[PDB]
Every structure is written in structure tokens, then in C-alpha cells.
Amino acid sequence: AVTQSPRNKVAVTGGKVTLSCNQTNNHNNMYWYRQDTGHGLRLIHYSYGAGSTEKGDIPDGYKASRPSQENFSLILELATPSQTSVYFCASGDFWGDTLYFGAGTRLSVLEDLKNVFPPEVAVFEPSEAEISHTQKATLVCLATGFYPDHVELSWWVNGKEVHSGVCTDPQPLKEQPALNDSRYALSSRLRVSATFWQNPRNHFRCQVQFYGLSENDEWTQDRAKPVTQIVSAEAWGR
């Protein structure tokens, strides 16, 4: 298997950033790709074995290290906003027909860091009309005012996570599409039977997992720290 670390990271400009990738497959070749819209996957550095690395198609800005057979590290010694991307590690055997990728690393190289915000979450109750017409109940969750877009949204009915009757937006939208400095917004829909919502015993909560600052990052602002956190909103059946 191929594991990357971290999976999410926020960095200031000029800061040093190391992305490590460890592989179980006992493969000799290891790779570091990045993914951007309209570019697909682009090779940064790779390695034919321990102690040796090679420059890829876009090596500028990055440095790599293969200290072990298992490990391949991508090093950003001087982070720049241009290096904001999703990084994928991969391993392959000699002349192997496949490449085995990791789940990916969401990296946001900011400058100011004062634009980082956790989302505000609100759950909106099913309309009587919908319950009276289609005999079903749609709950709508709404996470707003957050930056970066590093989040995971889920629904929890009676302490248990659900997937059936759920759809979330494919991607967060920009609240102020002009600015790239803009924060985002995300919506989700939970759909259940009218009888289920009518049950006062059942409670539903929309949960967003915000990925932000670590605690050992310097915070000089008045507001609460925008660390990695869970923000929830819940509704009870009526």
C-alpha cells in the first residue's frame, strides 16, 4: 500500500514543507506527481531506488529524497503559492505495467494566513409541502465562509453515519467569485421518509471536517484559532 503524509496541510509563503510517502509494495520505483486543473498529472521527481533521485518534467521548486526503499520524500524548502496543488505519490516495479498511487495530499501554500476560516454550519428542516406532496423529507446542510476548501462533509442519523439518501455538491463554490482570495460554500442533501422525519426520537446532524492550522502554528489574530476541527449542526424530528 501507499500512504502519504500529511493528507492536508496549510503553509505560509517561504515556509519549509516536506511531503513523505511510504510504500509497502516493495517496489523500486517511486514517484511524486501533482494535479492541477487543465494540466492533469505532472511528474516532479522520481527514483529508481534508495539513495538516488531523478528530476521530472517540472522539478523546479522541489527537491526529493529516497533515504529508504519504502520512503520517498518531496521537499518544498521555500513554499510559494504556485505550489498550491494536490500531490500524489506512486510506486512501480521494474518496467511495471502499472503505477500504484496514494490517496493524495491537499496542499495550500498561502501567504497571509489571515484568510483561513472554519465553516459555519446550518441544517435546514424539511418543508411541510414536500412531506405533504412526495411523502419524503429532505434535510439540507449548508457550510459557509471557509478557506481553504479542505473539508469532508457527512450525515449522522442516530449516532450512525449514513450514505443512503445522501448527495453532496461535487465541489465547493466561491462566495465572492471575483476574488481568488474568496472563501467558499458547500451544500448537502439528506432524504428520508416522511414517517422517519415525523419521528421525534430521530435526530440528524450534518458534520463537516474542516482541515486548517495545526496548533503549533503562530496565531496573532483576535478570533478563535482556525485549526483542524469538526463543525456540526443538528435537527430533531417533529
Binding site: V2, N29, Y33, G38, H39, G40, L41, R42, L43, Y46, D57, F88, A90, G92, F94, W95, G96, D97, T98, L99, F101, G102, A103, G104, A122, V123, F124, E125, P126, S127, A129, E130, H133, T134, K136, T138, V140, L142, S164, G165, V166, C167, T168, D169, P170, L173, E175, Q176, P177, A185, S187, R189, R191, V192, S193, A233, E234, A235, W236
Partner: protein, 197 residues
């Protein structure tokens, strides 16, 4: 760039054959893999052909290779909703080891709505009833929910959900502001038989 793909995005109805295109420039590529990437995951090898062959079939998935025209094609038969992903054409000179990728093609497979029942409901906040949201739902996948013609008003893209306890799928799109839901989805087309309670 080295490996070109087309189109950037492709939409297909379920059961239809989807065709993805790819073309390269270097004549020394000895192996052409196609990688599939689902949202939130990494890319995984779907199907692959090497330069000596002209085609390869693998259950609904088929690669056509033209060595002369430097052209590649991926054929997906009776496309299914679960086939909605990003598809990358890739090239290699090391039998699949050092891949140059294309820009990737985004594939969307539309669901056939059994019994469309387009309606725009409005939902009050659980904590503060002074806030609300508009919900477009139960419409057929054929319609397009275009974004707002202004700021201050936001409109999410459509999405399908599946109540698995029953046997039921439904489309849905959300709008919010600060307005009224009657004029919320004006910028898009709505079936004249849309229900406004």
C-alpha cells in the same frame, strides 16, 4: 504538450457508449495505460494497451490504438452512473513505468428519472427561523441548473441521491441568499409543470 485528450468533459446517458479520445506526439512510447480517478481518491489503472497491438477489450472497456495517426481511443459500453469519474490517457517508454498524463476527460453519466416531479420547496433553519433555503428537487437529469446572474444569490450544482431502503433516485439543487424561491431559479429552465407551494 506531450499527450492531448478530448473532450475536457463528456456527459452521457446511462446505457450509452462513451468514447474518450487521446493523442500523443512521441513515436517511442511502447505502452499506453488509461487511469481512472474517482473524486477524493488517487488514480488507478483501468485498462492498458502496448504499441504492438491495435486494440484491447476488457468487459465494457476497450482501447483502440492507431499507431499511424498517433491516436488512441477508449470505448465504454453501456455507461453506468458508477462510471462517473476522471479518465486519463497516459504514455510510457518504459512499459508503463514513467507516465506522462493527458489533461484528463471528466465523464458524467446521467440517471433516467423514473417519475419526474419537479418542485421548488423552501426550508426553514432548525436554530433560527429567520433564515431559509430553496430546494429544487425531483426533476429529470436532462435539465441544466445554471448559476446565478448576480452575486448575493448562490446556486449549487445538481446532484443525485439514492434512498436505498426504497428503490428511488432523485435530483436536487439548492439556492440561498441574504428574497423569494419563486424567482430563485429564474436564470435556468424549469418544466412548466413545476410545483410551487
Amino acid at each position: 504538450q506531450q499527450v492531448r485528450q478530448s473532450p475536457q468533459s463528456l456527459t452521457v446517458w446511462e446505457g450509452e457508449t462513451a468514447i474518450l479520445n487521446c493523442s500523443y506526439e512521441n513515436s517511442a512510447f511502447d505502452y499506453f495505460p488509461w487511469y481512472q480517478q474517482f473524486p477524493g481518491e488517487g488514480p488507478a489503472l483501468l485498462i492498458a494497451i502496448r504499441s504492438v497491438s491495435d486494440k484491447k477489450e476488457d468487459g465494457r472497456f476497450t482501447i483502440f490504438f492507431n499507431k499511424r495517426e498517433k491516436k488512441l481511443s477508449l470505448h465504454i459500453t453501456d455507461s453506468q452512473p458508477g462510471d462517473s469519474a476522471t479518465y486519463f490517457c497516459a504514455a510510457s517508454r518504459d512499459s508503463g513505468q514513467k507516465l506522462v498524463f493527458g489533461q484528463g476527460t471528466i465523464l458524467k453519466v446521467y440517471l433516467h428519472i423514473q417519475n419526474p416531479d419537479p418542485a421548488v420547496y423552501q426550508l426553514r433553519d432548525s436554530k433560527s427561523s429567520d433564515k431559509s433555503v430553496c430546494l429544487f428537487t425531483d426533476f429529470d437529469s436532462q435539465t441544466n441548473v445554471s448559476q446565478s446572474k448576480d452575486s448575493d444569490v448562490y446556486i449549487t450544482d445538481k446532484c443525485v441521491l439514492d434512498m436505498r431502503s426504497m428503490d428511488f433516485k432523485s435530483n436536487s439543487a439548492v439556492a440561498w441568499s441574504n428574497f423569494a424561491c419563486a424567482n430563485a431559479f429564474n436564470n435556468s429552465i424549469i418544466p412548466e409543470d413545476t410545483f410551487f407551494p
